[PDB]
Write a protein that binds this DNA or RNA. Structure first.
Ligand SMILES: O=Cc1cn([C@H]2C[C@H](O)[C@@H](COP(=O)(O)OP(=O)(O)OP(=O)(O)O)O2)c(=O)[nH]c1=O
Ligand SMILES: [Ca+2]
Ligand SMILES: [Ca+2]
Ligand SMILES: [Cl-]
Ligand SMILES: [Cl-]
Ligand SMILES: [Cl-]
Ligand code: NA
Ligand code: NA
Length: 326
DNA sequence: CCGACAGCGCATCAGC
DNA sequence: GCTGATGCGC
DNA sequence: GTCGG
């Protein structure tokens, strides 16, 4: 946190551009600059020094000079004073309320937590659950709790079918001492890139986790991706644990390594790696790495037998999960 | 200068 | 109903 | 907002 003031400023600008301005490329530019500054191992002394880093340009350099000189950014001080911007920024903190829905709610005079709770009939299912657990979803998950959650998920999955493999990914697999939510990568030998020999593979696992009262709510659910809510059991006379967000992704078993690369992240790491893949003439998603032909059309999937294989194709030295927290 | 910016699953909706 | 665009999320 | 070409 050598440069935490600068990176907090850039993150707040990013959130403004995403939630209020609906300018997704500015959001991504601010996030990229915040990420490269966060890993820079010196306390930045000037905007010129920061501008040497890729993704920091003239405008961010000038903002860094203002921030270093004064401890503030007038642009953000005004954004914080703007009622409409402040209202939109708040509403988007509810899961399921994005920039478009937030602005529509503000138009209708729905702009506070209190307004949402009085207008549950105007929320879709996702938004209603996001509101229900607004406070809980703000809280981080200690690694100790992530380990108990891992134990429950891996054991309940084994009870459905011992051939399932469940892997906890995200920041947990990167070794973080706390996580924002739990991400589970699921495989089963019946589901490959060549065939689906059993139906309901994801459903059966979700059902089992609901049966044991671990999964408590569903935000969305399809054949391969579950997004929902879970909760650790508590002991006698103990306060309940907060409800937690959980994502489950069922990935073809022969595409495990591309899948675990994607789901381990971080998100900025994936964007850096995929962008670099393009410059090398490849495209990476969660299933495959493919060559790009002379016309830009993705070719056939390349053989992958490890995470490192994906790094090797794009001429990157392998980076352990703990070194991907960009 | 200016095109491009990572890539995709599920929910919701308009148009038919 | 389906298809394609959009919103929101990972 | 930034960058490669
Ligand atoms: O959500 C955003 C995106 C996520 N991902 C991948 C990579 C990421 O690691 C994993 C899970 O997403 P999370 O939001 O749970 O992020 P975590 O790294 O686990 O951090 P937390 O500790 O939970 O905050 O999905 C992307 O590839 N792109 C995204 O845009
Ligand atoms: Ca996570
Ligand atoms: Ca997640
Ligand atoms: Cl933009
Ligand atoms: Cl500020
Ligand atoms: Cl593919
Ligand atoms: Na730069
Ligand atoms: Na939101």
């Amino acid at each position: 946190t050598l440069n935490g003031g600068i990176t907090d400023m850039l993150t707040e600008l990013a959130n403004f551009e995403k939630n209020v301005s609906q300018a997704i490329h500015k959001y991504n530019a601010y996030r990229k600059a915040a990420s490269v500054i966060a890993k820079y191992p010196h306390k930045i002394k000037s905007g010129a020094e920061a501008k040497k880093l890729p993704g920091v340009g003239t405008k961010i350099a000038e903002k860094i000079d203002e921030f270093l000189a004064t401890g503030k950014l007038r642009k953000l001080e005004k954004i914080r004073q703007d009622d409409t911007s402040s209202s939109i920024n708040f509403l988007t903190r509810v899961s399921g309320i994005g920039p478009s829905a937030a602005r529509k709610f503000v138009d209708e005079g729905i702009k506070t937590l209190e307004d949402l709770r009085k207008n549950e009939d105007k929320l879709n299912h996702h938004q209603r659950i996001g509101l229900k657990y607004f406070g809980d979803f703000e809280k981080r998950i200690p690694r100790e709790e992530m380990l108990q959650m891992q134990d429950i998920v891996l054991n309940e999955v084994k009870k459905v079918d011992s051939e399932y493999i469940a892997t906890v990914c995200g920041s947990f697999r990167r070794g973080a001492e706390s996580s924002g939510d739990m991400d589970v990568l699921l495989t089963h030998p019946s589901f490959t890139s060549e065939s689906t020999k059993q139906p309901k593979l994801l459903h059966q696992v979700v059902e089992q986790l609901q049966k044991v009262h671990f999964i408590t709510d569903t935000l969305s659910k399809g054949e391969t991706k579950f997004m929902g809510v879970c909760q650790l059991p508590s002991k006698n006379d103990e306060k309940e644990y907060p409800h937690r967000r959980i994502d489950i992704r069922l990935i073809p078993k022969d595409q495990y390594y591309c899948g675990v690369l994607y789901f381990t992240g971080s998100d900025i790491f994936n964007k850096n790696m995929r962008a670099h893949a393009l410059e090398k003439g490849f495209t990476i998603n969660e299933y495959t790495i493919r060559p790009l032909g002379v016309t830009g059309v993705a070719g056939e999937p390349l053989p992958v037998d490890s995470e490192k294989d994906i790094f090797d194709y794009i001429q990157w030295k392998y980076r352990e999960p703990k070194d991907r927290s960009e």
